[PDB]
Assembly symmetry: C3
Homo-oligomer: 208 residues x 3
Amino acid sequence: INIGNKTNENVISFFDSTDAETQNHNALMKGCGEFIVNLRTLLRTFRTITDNWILQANTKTPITDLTNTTDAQGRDYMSYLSYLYRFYRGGRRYKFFNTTPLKQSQTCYIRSFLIPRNYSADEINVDGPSHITYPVINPVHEVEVPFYSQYRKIPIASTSDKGYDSSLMYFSNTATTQIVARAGNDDFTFGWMIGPPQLQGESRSVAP
Amino acid sequence: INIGNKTNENVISFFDSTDAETQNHNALMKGCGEFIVNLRTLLRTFRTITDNWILQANTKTPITDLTNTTDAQGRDYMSYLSYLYRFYRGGRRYKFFNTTPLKQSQTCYIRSFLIPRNYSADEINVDGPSHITYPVINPVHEVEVPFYSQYRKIPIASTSDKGYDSSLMYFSNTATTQIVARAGNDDFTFGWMIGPPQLQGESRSVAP
Amino acid sequence: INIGNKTNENVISFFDSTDAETQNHNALMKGCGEFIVNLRTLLRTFRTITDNWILQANTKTPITDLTNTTDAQGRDYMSYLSYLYRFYRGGRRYKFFNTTPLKQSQTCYIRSFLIPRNYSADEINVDGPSHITYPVINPVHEVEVPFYSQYRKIPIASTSDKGYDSSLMYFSNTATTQIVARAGNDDFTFGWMIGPPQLQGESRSVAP
């Protein structure tokens, strides 16, 4: 019974029932039918980042006019899981579901181009790999931006070195309004884990 | 030279002379001639519990009118060693040495019966195993009460459950006076040791 | 991280260069040419204890009229190394370099005798082993006192038991003046080490 603090940690487990890895597998044959192991696979499912993205006719719009607003929110999985990590890597996918009250007397088309990140519309050309769809027959514009980077990984909010990896540019001949839903491609991943931020609950606007 | 109390007891023996079990055996071949090992064997030697037990003629007297007075004293070995223990077991023996100024013109006899413990004389019959002696020819009445119990061991001063083991009842046609000396039988033992009480010395009755 | 002082000494050596016993041997092939191992060998080199030992003609002079003055000083090696030790053993050697303005019209000779230690000149005879030199042809009087002792070792400043080992007595027919240089013989050694005394620096005799 000497004097001085000590160590020798005593791991105790209550409830000597059954090894838990058998009980989990027996609980997902009856309640799920699926077994979500990795959070990387939630970066490959398309979750909608907006519901009404209103644009004007004949205006080249980068996705960083939308993504820069919705990265802070943490609504979808690529912006909620990004608060646990500090780097990323890989391309991104997009889907553009049409919700426009279209006219028949025009022919609407949806172009898509590449800009490097955070340039505007006037300081880039339109001579690159593109994709065009027609919303009267194909209301979903599906596009994939690859990973064309100078660096092997990208941080969040870096220095004045801008335009070091590619992104998407949107174009349409008519003033459209869409539902944007993004996900990562087959090589997209985060890394270099940190701890989480806070969360936000309801907003009741109480009487006093 | 760290801080904290410790253990590791240091048994030291003074006087490296000779192993003591040889010295004890060599000291009892010259001073005793006997070697008292066990205290159980002192329960088989008869020690006198009284010197003048005066009775009246034609009166059935239980030994618990005498034993209940002399259990508290601790004079003999069955009442001195009983303060170290809490239980007992087995029968008891008695001897009744006659010290009566007898007459020749009567025929004195000494009956002895069984009562269960702590009954009186009127609430028991006399139909049992008995013993009769004649003090004009046999001045010592030797009797043995067996162990006829409902329980495998008996405590000291139990509940209102009375009469759960047998005892002795005395009878004589004349007013006799005796020397009672008890001991245990071949199965008598104590058990379940506790610590001793105090002892009592002299009583001088000093002048102030 | 218990409470209590401890032990377990951590010998650390700076400068992982090369084993030093190789570096010392490589440094004495280039700077010394000699390797002084033992301090006992410095008791066999003659160092001068005085520079002008003036005597009178026809006077038997013990060396303890000089040695008792110069043992305290610590100038030579036998009086500087003696402050580290408490005993000694063995004989001593002497050399007497002549520095007298001699005359030709006399014949100078230098006798040397034995006294036991600390006697005077009048309480000893001259019948013993002697040595005579002539400073006109042999200016160095070399003599060796052996170890003729009652004890196997001699302390410093003992009791009133005096004259327990031999020493030297000087004699000369003329008033000479010499340079005395002593050393131990082939059996001389100190022993039974103690710690050193203090040392003495300069004496400037400053202006205030």
